[PDB]
Write a protein that binds this ligand. Structure first.
Ligand SMILES: CCCCCCCCCCCCCCCC(=O)O
Ligand SMILES: CCCCCCCCCCCCCCCC(=O)O
Lengths: 267, 120, 283, 57, 68, 283, 68, 267, 136
């Protein structure tokens, strides 16, 4: 009648607005919408700081590229947004913090392009090491690659330099980077951007953890993994390229225990 | 502890013959079948041949027809796989799958297997 | 109100169709699974469904006891050089494979924990000597409590620790432990570090493990032969069997595809091949 | 839950009804992804130990 | 303070004057003060898998076109 | 409403007769049995019947436990050449004769199954050595589950399998198993084959056994000595006793006349003679 | 939730002020949730063997000629 | 609102389901839906066999090809389904038989393809002979070409071998194969698959005849003729090719007079 | 006497021509190529049990002096509600002469037996392509 569609979506958070004309509806992770801490589940005694508009807005992470060679890409939340306006500021200023997200992945092309990208949301997305000698050895500096994030690899290559280890994640694509067959990755809330159909993936994520509120600096709640289910193909070309852009918006964020700022050793 | 242990080696030239054996123990409830299976270097595990319980009634795989011979010695509680005219397609691992069966597919006991190589 | 032992929804008789409705067409881009039943695609008769999901309930799926660890202790002769073997095991489900993978089907859990103790002893040295029925103390040492250094030191007084003196030959030992977690759920996977590497600090001072919370999460059990030295050596094996009762879980995760390697999520090379060979057009 | 004749299940097959047609300047080959799932009427019984994992020594 | 619960009869004995028929029940009485000690009830609820099957914001209607 | 322990119908007093009614004449061509009682053919007095059929009820006829199999295992010395004997037995009532024939009185049945385990051990080698009371695990491996290859391999963790750790010297072991059949009745005789020999297929590919359903119908039990190697060899025999409870049956079949031969209906030669010599006119 | 059932007295003790007489009963209480676990009731029904004795379509009347 | 369209159609018969996303509605021949024989119009006295699910299901006939050279194609019902599962079995087992059909013709292409195919349903589709010497001379073996069916020709070429005639139909395309101008072919229930628009043709046909029930072996009720109204064209190509697939489903089929099976001389 | 349950499908299902019972059990000795058939001893009702007990099954006895036919209506009987007919046979029709044939003072009498069976309340599920079994 009036023309309301599932493909046409307009999301708004604070002073930012995301639109789209080729969506595939939207995903509310585990059906729960992100929310503020209820007195019933409260834990720290102090008055929590809720930045709201100050932090609850979409932040665009630098754009990555997609080619036939691409194995995959990954990020961590809140990690990924560690240096995004006030959200980061507030994050670094408090001992505790809980936040939900509205993850929107953008990757458009032509009706002449073909492929599929599975944007997966994994709470506690633990990734595997690169050493056949030392388990759980990835260093913090490699565990949290910020807004630039990381990638998946097509082959597991052990780290042999035991004089100075590389201490990073070697997340095998087919193993979803955690010793399990990718095909089962659908148990996690997800959407698959299939070029011929849509152009974006929106995954609203509530705060999920073992605790009501937790140290954000130390621990990542969610994980955003994007791997090409179908490889990129365009025309009769040998080198096609299309970009992927991630915009994430923290929601219902609250922080407790205000203190001096933490300057982490990221490098 | 139905111990199935293969033997027979595998390093012949193209065209020869080998004797693949299999020592059986535990409680093989005779009635049913006793057989052989190959996995191949890079293919799916395939059925070679099956012989009846104590009966010398058997069959062979289309691919191996007549070039492989599977018998038994229930006195010695063994099964044998004589293989004449070994070839580049026969190069593979062989397994004594002799339990239950009732046909040429069902099992509850396999062996560790042995490799065969027909070189040339 | 729909219980575990409920009969499943019936199959409704549906006839031929030629309409603008499309059960058959969907779009798995939405992430959503198309929820159909036979009737939606083919003609069906009416079927009174009898089967129930009874056994597949979370509680029932873990209703089995499982071997978590094998603790070995011994009682040697008094004259001997080596000390009387008394074991100390860090309480964790990740030492064995089976139970772990089952627990890994989810992200978090809560369960009152039941432990069972199956002890089994024997002699070792070729001799016809004798050992009188042996007793065994299983002392739970919670994190921070004094861990015994000797088999006969003060620690075995257990004024506050919960212990179980098992007499050999009687029925296996069993104790109940509630959900003792410091969090609001037990964490199977923890994507984070215990420490934060600060910039005004040395890398060493700020370093820790990946995937670990507290090194000492639940404590250690200590088991020793209570009876004193006997001229003939007797070794013993205490097998622990855990059955997670009153269990709840959250957020499913893909089941482990490749063999475990360490307490982490990490995978060793040479085991990265789980699916076998099968031709696409071969049934 | 094992390969058995007595409890065999049948065959799932996929065949080209017509064919795949693409205009010019279009990738002539593409991919299809398959998914499987049980239905509301599905159930499982007699709990048992799996083989998809093991601990050698 | 006994807990009497009913059983889901499977193999029916040739009786309806003791067994088979007239609903079979079972008694349970806790012996310890701790909740942990109790025996596992097994009288648990089931639920809608839609929280996993249909994690969508706008209701899924099987009969219509998914993307409208 | 007529129960098992009911008094049987009484004997009615009937006198002399001379009428057109014929209880005495029938025709067994109709297949039907002529239903008479003494009074029908001879003069009788009145008799208050006391006897009941109480014991002859289907449930009561199977109310006995029966030895289904004898599983043998052993625990040898550590230095030994041969491996520690651990048995695996395919669960079936047809290994022994007695219970089988009783179950063969009908075509189909349903029964919750009770198993009892009587273990008995002894030494073997001439020596005065010692073995401490031994434990025994009885692990039920359902069809498809990993069958143990070693006495000490991963399989004994039993994270999902139902096991029973029996300590020697205590009362025999017992577990309850419901009617676990895949059909709506257990099948004693199955006139058919599991496979169908198609024409577009090789005879081998389509061949199977006569009278068999699924090779693995119920699974296997695995029994092992839990205690580790002991310098003096100890062999053990676990005897299983099954008592079919809550039993129902259908369609009676003539009882087995000649000795059993294999799991089938087949008969061996040299046993085809069951009835002895008796002269027709000799009481 | 005890199950009290009566017994069919056989050998009567010289009593009717405890035993022998005033109907002897027995108590039973199930201890497990599974129906399989229960003890065999033994209070089973009997039935007409005619389903085997007279498998005929037209009723069998003993007093008359079988084939009429 | 909910998105219900004329192009999107899902038909289901027995254990078979036909879908489509580019349809042009559907045609019920002469407005009557296929139906079972009513006591009012009954004729044979015996209890009729109604195979239902056993025969009332879609059967796919081998796929034919469409090129710029193609003149036409034709089939006969029930003839065409003479060897389709139980429907054929039952057909051969009875003296009488009446059946309706749900004919669905499938022929897709690209938005860059062009042409039109007129699938016509002609009750009693009598076709013309190939001899200028002998009228009505086509032999049974040529009258019933089963599932492979026949074709139309662009020119009438008489059969001259009077030593052994070819005895087949020479159905001139423009004459609709029966001495009448094709342009009038629309008087029969029909749909025209015009590439730019649709991708299928669905023609539900009721039993139509001079008798309530009739010998199927001897007589064909309907006729399915497909002729290219607009020739096939693709890009700037000289040899384009796209396939056409026919799936027909017998409906409300009933058979009377059960006897031994008829083994017809088809060759 | 060497292989139990060894009768091949082709011998298990002799179609409309059916089979017979034998007066003596003769083992199959050719272990090079077995005959793989049923050797159903008459007195053992072909299944190791005394014929005299064969009456526990629904039955009629055609006794020449009296009748001329046997009618046995049989319901579907099995362990399952519906089952693979190709693979499994529900019922069995065995006819054995309780009293041998005798006519006049003749040495070679002969009379025929004809079986007419009618399937009833038949239902089939899971329609698919036709199975062409290897009967020979
Ligand atoms: C006598 C023993 C008393 C107490 C025993 C305490 C051991 C508790 C073990 C619980 C295991 C739960 C594992 C979940 C891991 C987690 O919390 O992150
Ligand atoms: C701990 C043991 C648990 C389960 C044990 C399963 C064994 C079941 C054996 C049942 C025997 C019934 C035989 C009937 C044959 C049939 O079904 O055709």
């Amino acid at each position: 009648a009036c023309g309301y569609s599932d493909r046409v979506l307009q999301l708004t958070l604070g002073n930012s607005t995301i639109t789209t004309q080729e969506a595939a509806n939207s995903v509310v992770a585990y059906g729960r919408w992100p929310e503020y801490l209820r007195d019933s589940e409260a834990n720290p005694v102090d008055q929590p700081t809720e930045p709201d508009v100050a932090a609850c807005r979409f932040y665009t992470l630098d754009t990555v590229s997609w080619t036939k060679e691409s194995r995959g890409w990954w990020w961590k939340l809140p990690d990924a947004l560690r240096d995004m306006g006030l959200f980061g500021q507030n994050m670094y200023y408090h001992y505790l913090g809980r936040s939900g997200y509205t993850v929107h992945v953008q990757c458009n092309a032509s009706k002449f392009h073909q492929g599929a990208l599975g944007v997966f949301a994994v709470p506690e997305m633990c990734l595997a090491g690169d050493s056949n000698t030392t388990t759980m050895h990835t260093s913090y500096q490699n565990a949290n690659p910020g807004e630039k994030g990381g990638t998946f690899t097509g082959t597991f290559t052990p780290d042999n330099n035991q004089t100075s280890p590389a201490r990073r994640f070697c997340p095998v694509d087919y193993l979803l980077g955690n010793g399990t067959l990718l095909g089962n990755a659908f148990v996690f809330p997800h959407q698959i951007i299939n070029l011929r159909t849509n152009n974006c993936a929106t995954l609203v994520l509530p705060y999920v953890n073992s605790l009501s509120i937790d140290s954000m600096v130390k621990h990542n709640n969610w994980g955003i993994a994007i791997l090409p289910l179908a490889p990129l193909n365009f025309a009769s070309e040998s080198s096609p390229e299309i970009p992927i852009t991630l915009t994430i918006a923290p929601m219902c964020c609250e922080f407790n225990g205000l203190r001096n700022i933490t300057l982490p050793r990221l490098q | 502890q139905v111990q199935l242990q293969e033997s027979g080696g595998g390093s012949a030239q193209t065209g020869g013959s080998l004797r693949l054996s299999c020592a059986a123990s535990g409680f093989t409830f005779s009635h049913g079948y006793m057989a052989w299976f190959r996995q191949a270097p890079e293919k799916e595990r395939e059925w070679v041949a099956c012989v009846r319980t104590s009966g010398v009634s058997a069959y062979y795989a289309d691919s191996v027809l007549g070039r492989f011979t599977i018998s038994q010695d229930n006195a010695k509680s063994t099964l044998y796989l004589q293989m004449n005219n070994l070839k580049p397609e026969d190069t593979a691992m062989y397994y004594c799958a002799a339990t239950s069966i009732s046909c040429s597919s069902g099992y509850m006991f396999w062996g560790q297997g042995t490799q065969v190589t027909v070189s040339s | 109100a729909a219980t575990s032992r409920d009969a499943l929804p019936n199959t409704e008789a549906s006839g031929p169709t030629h309409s603008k409705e499309i059960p058959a067409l969907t779009a798995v881009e939405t992430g959503a699974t198309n929820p159909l039943v036979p009737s939606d695609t083919v003609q069906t008769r009416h079927v009174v469904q009898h089967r129930s999901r009874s056994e597949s309930s979370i509680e029932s799926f873990f209703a089995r006891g499982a071997c978590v660890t094998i603790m070995t202790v011994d009682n040697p002769a008094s004259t001997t050089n080596k000390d009387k073997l008394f074991a100390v095991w860090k309480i964790t489900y990740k030492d064995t494979v089976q139970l772990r993978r089952k627990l890994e089907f989810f992200t978090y859990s809560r369960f009152d924990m039941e432990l069972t103790f199956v002890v089994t002893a024997n002699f070792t040295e070729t001799n016809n000597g004798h050992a009188l029925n042996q007793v065994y103390q299983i002392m739970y040492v919670p994190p921070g409590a004094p861990v015994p250094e000797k088999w006969d030191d003060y620690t075995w007084q257990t004024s506050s620790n919960p212990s179980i003196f098992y007499t050999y030959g009687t029925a296996p030992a069993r104790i109940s432990v509630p959900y003792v977690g410091i969090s609001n759920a037990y964490s199977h996977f923890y994507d984070g570090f215990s420490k934060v590497p600060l910039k005004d600090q040395s890398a060493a001072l700020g370093d820790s493990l990946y995937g670990a919370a507290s090194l000492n999460d639940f404590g250690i059990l200590a088991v020793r032969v209570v009876n004193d030295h006997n001229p003939t050596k007797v070794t013993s094996k205490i097998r622990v069997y855990l059955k997670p009762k009153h269990i709840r879980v959250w957020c499913p995760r893909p089941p482990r595809a490749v063999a475990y390697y360490g307490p982490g999520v990490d995978y060793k090379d040479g085991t990265l091949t789980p699916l076998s060979t099968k031709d696409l057009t071969t049934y | 839950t094992i390969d058995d004749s007595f409890t065999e299940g049948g065959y799932i097959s996929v065949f080209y009804q017509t064919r795949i047609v693409v205009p010019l300047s279009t990738p002539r080959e593409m991919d299809i992804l398959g998914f499987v799932s049980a239905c509301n009427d599905f159930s499982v019984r007699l709990l048992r130990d799996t083989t998809h994992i093991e601990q050698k020594a | 303070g006994a807990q009497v619960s009913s059983q889901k009869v499977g193999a029916h004995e040739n009786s309806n004057r003791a067994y088979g028929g007239s609903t079979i029940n079972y008694t349970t009485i806790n012996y310890y003060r701790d909740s942990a000690s109790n025996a596992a009830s097994k009288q648990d609820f089931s639920q809608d898998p839609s929280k996993f099957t249909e994690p969508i914001k706008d209701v899924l209607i099987k009969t219509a076109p998914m993307l409208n």
